[model samples]
Every structure is written in structure tokens, then in C-alpha cells.
Target: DHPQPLDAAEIPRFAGIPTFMRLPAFTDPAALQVGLIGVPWDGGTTNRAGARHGPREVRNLSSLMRKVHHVSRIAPYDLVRVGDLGDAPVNPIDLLDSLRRIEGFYRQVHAAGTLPLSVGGDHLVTLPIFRALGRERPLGMVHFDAHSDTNDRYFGDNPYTHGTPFRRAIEEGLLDPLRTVQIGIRGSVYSPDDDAFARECGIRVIHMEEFVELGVEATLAEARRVVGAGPTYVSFDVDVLDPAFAPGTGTPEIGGMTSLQAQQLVRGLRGLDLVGADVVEVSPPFDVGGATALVGATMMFELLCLLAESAAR
Candidate 1:
């Protein structure tokens, strides 16, 4: 028997329990193809920290998500057994402990052979996830963020902040730098060599200017060309979208991709062997209305469509 959400027509979106897309809360991972998980802790952020509340607010808006994709015609709910597996147990006071807990939770999901679609606390959450998913082999990654996030240290020799996860991942061999591509990277930085580490590691760093020059289709094509059938992960930080579209984040960058452009990029990654994905840095406290949360929720839905299609193939 195929289990799905309570029919929206039978029960209004506002009435039911609010999981991602109002999906059922199925705790058993063996019963699912994809798990929508939450890591609601932002201890890793350096400044303007409020993304810890991202999951609850994103869940609130995703109640409006319909079954079928408007463009791709992919009904993710039917393609895969999907549901909210609920949030990871996070230590609000301890960043290191939370990283361990987050990885431990994803380890359980991997054990059950379920692919994860996570809503993150910050970009740092990816480090633990990479550790969990890349136990046997390193993963290729498609990362969208305003900043390169490859810095070695932060706040004077303090490692393990939101700005330095990917760098650490590379050092640990959790991700293959040669197969990784970072898109929509643009912002002021402390020094000229901010991206030197990425280049040295051989990651394809596509700055915003280059992203615009290549266009969405070309950029996505390049991503596929590099990743090419390897087990891949997609990490999207909302700050990669222009502050006009996504202002409620720990860090805001001005000249970034549009909402439509971001959607197109996700939709185009349909055929990749995507093992897992995450959307991070949606801070509800700084939002003017609920616009940022809605966009974040919609992006999560778009990612689900791609992950579902990939799983079905």
C-alpha cells in the first residue's frame, strides 16, 4: 500500500499537522525513499544569528505546497515514499556536540537506505552530513552560496563556523574537491586569497558574474559535466539568492541570483544521482513578512522533485 499525505481537498492545508508539504510524520526510515529532516540550530553562524528557527517557519509555509510540479510535471509524493522524519536533536549551547548529533541522525537515515532532504541550521550542518553520507567514498557537490565558505579559520583560530565547513570537508576527504562546483559565489571578503583555497583544491568556483555570463542552463550543464554520475550532494544557502528575494539570513549579499534563476538551476539537476541535499540560512526573525520562508519552502519542494526523480530512475 502506498502511503501519502492526507488529501488537501478532504482536509484544508491550515487544519492538518504541518510537516514539510503536510506529509505524514513517518519515523520508520525503512518505509521511505526520502526523509525531510530539520536541524534547527544556528550555533555555527558568526553574526546576526537567528536561522535556528528556520525549520519551524519553513514547515509553516510548505503547507501550501501542492502535489505536482508546475513545470516538470513531477509529483514527488508519488515518485517516492516521502515524509517528515522530524528534526535532529541539536545542542543549542554546544556547536561541536550538535555537529556530532546531526551526523549521528543522518547516519541512522543512511543505515535505513533513505536519502535525506534536510532543512539546515546553517551551512556548517553540511560537514556532518558529508561525514555521514561519504563514509565509503567522497561525494561530488553542487553548492550555491554568496560566500565561498572555504575559509580555514574564523574569529582568530576558531575552526568550525558556518563559513568554513566545505574547507574542512575537503581536508577530511568527505567530498571530492575536483568534482565539486560552487555557484553564485560573490561578496566582499577579508583578503584577496579568500577563494585561493578553493582553486588550489580544484573545485569549480563560479562567481556571480561568471554565473550570469554562463546563464542558468549553461551553468547547470557545466555542473552535470563535472559531477557526471558520481554520488552528488546539493547544498543551497539562501544568501545565494539576492537580498531582495531572501533578506532573512545571517549574511546578506546584494548582487546574487534571482528566485526564478535559482529554481531553474535546481530543476535542471533532475538526472543526477543525488544522494542528499540541504537548504540553509533562512532566518525567520529578520524577515519583513514571511517571504523568505515561503521562498525557502518552495526551493525545498523543488529539490524534492529532483531528488524524487533521481531516486525513481
Candidate 2:
């Protein structure tokens, strides 16, 4: 195996570039099994925008992250080659231009044969990511969020918003709606018909009420059942955690999963054939303390463990 992370004892926890989890900042595709990525743009956020600032804050706070999983005992740095590939190309001014650049960046990663584990600028960044990875075969997904994000359009067919990425994904054949399961969905809705397109396309919707009824383990079981063993993507929006747990986001929904529960859900995905993954929507402008960005960074660690193991195999 390549060199593992430098000891916190040797370099101190607060030293060096705060690349994801303090791993070295290696970008060589031939040497990496998993590449940590950042999409630092929030042009798609509809209101209360600040996710554009997420990657920087998450990176800054991630310096304190330690290697080795406490529960699974998986030392991802030891098991596989991992490094910070750095942030994607983004234009803060133009929405569609940013999508194009983001997709192009990940396309290079795909060509380099590295699995991407990303921290997002907002939920909209995901659509471009899928555009890069899902061209050869449609991917299945396990989505954690407060809303379906499946609307066909916003502002009367304006067709671009953080709210409509998955709907557009379906239309592009990037993700198989039948094999996708969105969990932790709650909060009020604009219309009863908001989810019609997703439902008709066969995406599984697990409302917060049903999630409580089934509990985390059972819900995870349902997720694995739906996605099976095909190549899958794990999409975690930090807003999936109760607003009390993570208030730094464009949209905060109450009555959601706890931080530990979120970790458990990701751990349960250990054996799946994961292609890539992301943790998104950490808006630091609304955060209390640094709690929200910490959640995003921690979730990125969790996803890295899963992606590294999957990529190694």
C-alpha cells in the first residue's frame, strides 16, 4: 500500500493544508482509488444562498478529522490510495456554465479511473456529477434529503434550480428512477403533485413518517433491496439531519435523522458496489458555531471509507 496519513502526533492536528481528513493532496489518477473532490459553487440555490462557501469551510474544519474508523475498524488510508484531487472548476456567476465545468472536471476523473467522493456547493452540483459518471450505464442511488428535488422545472419551465436536479437526471437517463430510494423526506410541500414525476418514473420515496416506522436499519435494508448490487451512488444532503443538528443549509427541515443515525445508514452500505458519492448542502452562513460544516466533513469521511473499500475491491 502507499504511505498512510502522517501521524497527528508528528505534524499536529492543526498543521498543513486541510485536505479531506488530513490525507496528502495527491491528484495522480494512476495512484488513487478514491479522489476527494469539492464543487464550490451555489449558483443554483433558490434562496438564502451560501452553499457556495461550503467546500472552503468544510475543508478548513476537516483538519481535525482522524484516520481509522472507530466502529468498522477500517483504516481507509492504509487500505487504499486516497488523496485530495482538489475542487472542481466553477463559475460563481453563471449557473449553466458552472454545470458544464463541473461535469468536465469529473469527466477527467472518470477517464483517470478514480472514484469520486465529493463535498458539494449545493444539491444542484449533483446533476453535473451524474452527467459525468452515468453516461455508460444508468446508476442506482440511495438519496438522503428533506425534499424529492424532482420537480420538472421552477419559475414556470425555467428548468434550473437546486430543487429539480433529480428530475432532470431521470430525463437524461443518468439515474434509474426505479432503483433509486430517497429517504428522510419531510417538511411542507408546495403542491400534492410535486412528486408525481418521480413516482411515475418508479423512484422509491420514503417519507420521514415511514422512516420512523421502519427505523434506520430496516430503512437501510429497504434501500439495499431497491438498489441491489448494481453500481450505485450515495447522495447525502446534510439537511437530511434535523435542522437542530445541522442548521447551516439553504433549506432546513425539522424531524429528520440524527447524526449517529446518518453514520449508521452510511456504514450499512459497506458491501454495495459503490461507484461514487457526495455529501452536500452545508451552508455556513446560517450555521450555529461550526456544527454544520463539521457534519459535512464527517459525512465525507464516512463516504470515503465506503468508496475506498468499494474501489479497492
Candidate 3:
């Protein structure tokens, strides 16, 4: 039988072990079709820290998630065998060690042919995941963030940071630049040349101005066209939403997408060949009333539904 989340009516939502969405925990990746994972290390964060606390809080808040999608009526548990596979190993003191451990964890998931839906320590966490999953064939991406995250280095030539994951991923052949798309990009940069790598590599970037002009539907259409039918990964950084809606993230960029818009964007990614996905950068220490964690959990649920559907196919 497929593992199911604890039924809220029978057991109090507050009284469980607090896996993602209160789902059962599975030690073996081979036992699950979709695995819910946590990477609770934020060493790659350059500015404010504390995204290290993201996964635990997000797990606590994910209890509020229900089985069926109100909009699409997708009951993800019924569609595939999904369970929380728990957190990946990490070394808080060493960023390179954390990257190695995270990649090793995902390599196990990949070997088992299980799709991963992860909650992250920071945006930088996506790099190691790409290293694991994209080893055989580079994957396409639909990236939602307030920044492009393609800048080459930080703090005097440190190539691995939250700001440079995608750039490194592309350089290492973990991601296909031509098929990758970044949405909701805004904010000032150190230099106008900051996005030069993305441009030179042909990554489709629909900046906030273009997003507003094209609107959600057309922007989503563009995203679909970019990724096409290839295996794709979805990464949602909470800072993509304005501080008014998601104040808990490390970088709060103004003029960002609303929570509803974020949901619609994820929902729009229904038919892509999704291999894995993540909801990252929800720092609980900065959160107000656990709103950002809720947003993270909710977005994770949305991605879980998409992964479930894709796995079913």
C-alpha cells in the first residue's frame, strides 16, 4: 500500500512526527516514487544566515497541507507512492563538504528512480542536487527568484555561494543553459554586467518588467516553450515573492510576485518531464507568524503534485 499522510481528523495535526505534510518517513529511497527531503545547511548564504532553520519550520508548518488541490483536484497521495525521506547529511562548518554530502544523498535517490521534492537551506543547495541528477544528462530548469543567481563569484572570487549556483551548474554541465529559464528577476546589482553569463549562455530570463508586460499566462507559456518536453527541475526561492507576502527570506526584493501568482506559475508546470524540484530560502528567524514557512510548505505541496503527476506518467 502507498504510504499516506496522517489523517488530521484522527490525529491532531500538531501532535505528529512533523514530516513534510505530516507524511510517513521512509529510510529507503527505493520504497518511494517521490521523496520529500530536507537540506538544512545554509553555509552558502552570503548575506543574512538562518535559512539553516528553514526545513524544520517548513516541516512543522506543512502539517496544514491537505490531500487534494483546491484548484486542480490533484490528490497527490493517490497518484503516487510518496513519503518523507528525511534530511540529507550536511556539514554546517564546511560548504564544500555539505555540497559533497548533499550530492551523495541525491545520487541514492536518483539511483532508485525516485523523484525528489526538497526543502532547502538556501538557493545554493540546488547546485549539489543538480550535480547528482544532471550527471547523466543535463536538465532544463524553471527557476523562480528575485535575482538571476547566475553571478560568477562573491566575497573575492568565492565561486560557490547562493548567488552563483546556477552559473556553476551551467559551467559544470549540470544544467542546460539554452533550456533554462529564470523568472521574477529584479533588484539592483553590483554591476550591469552581472547577468552577462546568462545572456551569453542563452538562458531565457523573463525579468519582472517583461513578466508584468507578458502577464502570468504568457510568461508561463514562454517557460513551457523554453523547457519543452525535456526533463526539467523547478526551483522556487521564497524571495521571489515581495517582502509584503514573504518577509521571512534573507533577501526581500520589492515588486515581486504575489503568493497567488506563484501558485499559478507552479501549477502551470503540470506537463513537463519533472525529475526533481525544491522550495528554498525560507529563513524562520526572519519570519512573521510563520507565513514564509507556510508559503514554502504550500509551494512544496504544489511541486509535489506536479512531481506525482509526472511520476504517474
Question: RMSD per prediction, one decimal?
Answer: 1.0, 1.2, 0.8
Model 1 bad stretches (over 4 Å):
none
Indicate the TM-score of model 1.
0.98
lDDT of 3 by residue, 140-221 (tens): 9999999999888787969999999999999999999999999999998888588888889999999988999999999999
Q: Write the per-residue lDDT of candidate 1 for residues 95-201, one digit (tens) a residue.
A: 88999999898899999989999997889888898889998799999999998889888879888989999999999999999999999988788996788888888
Per-model lDDT: 0.90, 0.88, 0.94
Error of 3 at 228 (Å): 0.4
Q: What lDDT would candidate 2 get against the real structure?
A: 0.88
Off by over 4 Å in 2: 1-3
- Candidate order by TM-score, decreasing, is 3, 1, 2
**Candidate that would win on TM-score:** 3
> If both were scored by TM-score, which would come out higher, candidate 1 or candidate 2?
1
Against the true structure, candidate 3 has what lDDT? 0.94
